[PDB]
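User: Hello! I'm new to structural biology and keep hearing that structure can be predicted from sequence alone. Could you demonstrate with alpha-n-acetylglucosaminidase family protein? Please show me the input and the output so I can see what each looks like.

Assistant: Of course. The first part below is the input, the amino acid sequence of alpha-n-acetylglucosaminidase family protein. The second part is the output, the predicted structure written as tokens.
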Amino acid sequence: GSHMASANYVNIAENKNVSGSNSQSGNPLSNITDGDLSSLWISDNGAMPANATIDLEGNNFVDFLELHFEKEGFRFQFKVEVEDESGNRETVLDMTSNTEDNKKSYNIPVKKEISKIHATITGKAPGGSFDQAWAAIAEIKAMS
Ligand SMILES: CC(=O)N[C@H]1[C@@H](O[C@@H]2[C@H](O)[C@@H](O)[C@H](O)O[C@@H]2CO)O[C@H](CO)[C@@H](O)[C@@H]1O
Ligand SMILES: [Ca+2]
């Protein structure tokens, strides 16, 4: 880890502010950083593009991000970006032109000092076993 005490990786995203687009009832934005992989954020009425921004309260080194979904199968099209205090922005997982299945979680290597995490579901790919699901994110973790 980059943190003293040594340990391994720390979830510095956990409990941090989450802002973005409308949530449906019982599925608010905070569910993205609550440390529980079963609780979800779901966009109000499946409205897309849907976004979520985790504020890490200033620059922290982050090794890699963890984008967790409800389960495997969903065919969402999603962008994941990062931002520092300086105003620099970098797409770390560009998957907006996705066709076919998404897996349950994604490791997204960063290895940069960042202050913000921009997760954006831009649309839904045709087909799949779950063609009916709404724009949802279970958890985003920031490992440093
Ligand atoms: C039956 C189905 O497609 N379930 C999905 C889907 O649920 C929708 C919504 O989130 C619920 O609040 C509502 O009661 O049912 C909707 C179906 O029209 O999407 C979510 C993820 O976005 C999944 O949890 C369900 O499995
Ligand atoms: Ca959660």
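User: So the tokens describe the shape?

Assistant: Right, they're a compact way of writing down the 3D structure. Reading them back into a model, for example: Residues 45 and 142 are 28 Å apart (CA to CA).
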